[PDB]
Design a protein around this ligand. Sequence first.
Ligand SMILES: Cc1cc2nc3c(=O)[nH]c(=O)nc-3n(C[C@H](O)[C@H](O)[C@H](O)COP(=O)(O)O)c2cc1C
Length: 163
Amino acid sequence: GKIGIFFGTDSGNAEAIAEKISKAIGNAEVVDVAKASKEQFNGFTKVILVAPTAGAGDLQTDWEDFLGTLEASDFANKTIGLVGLGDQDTYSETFAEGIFHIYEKAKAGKVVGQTSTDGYHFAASKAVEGGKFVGLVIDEDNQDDLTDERIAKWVEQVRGSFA
Ligand SMILES: Cc1cc2nc3c(=O)[nH]c(=O)nc-3n(C[C@H](O)[C@H](O)[C@H](O)COP(=O)(O)O)c2cc1C
């Protein structure tokens, strides 16, 4: 209920991921950003932002438009978790960068869930700050076989940060 998990998708991967996190974290509400509003968004104090990476490393359409109506002040009082989707093989130099764009404003609040870069193969990605991943990264086009465990470990790590 209280944990707002906002996602945006084109194919459906993100939606499916958001759903898997909800079940694994519990006490959560999945919300498609394409229908979300600023008012609804601020109704939560804890949020998990799952966003797929569009061409060039930019945000999926739904997300870019929703994010544009948000300022840093809106993230200030929240605890935030970022989950990005990407294709590390086809896009070695833009791997899951969408998240980074959300990060530009989300850094105003309390961000948690930074992940190690071990187990990935790519060239560049703004999503990496301090030799670490700004949040959880998922690859459904190349590493679908590692998702279920990654979400599990992530939920474990960040679990305590949410309540
Ligand atoms: C037009 C297009 C552009 C993409 N650009 C990138 C990119 O720049 N970096 C990346 O890591 N993945 C990129 N991808 C792969 C997606 O991030 C990945 O497949 C994701 O799972 C898509 O999520 P969705 O099914 O929820 O829309 C792109 C996919 C498409 C169709």
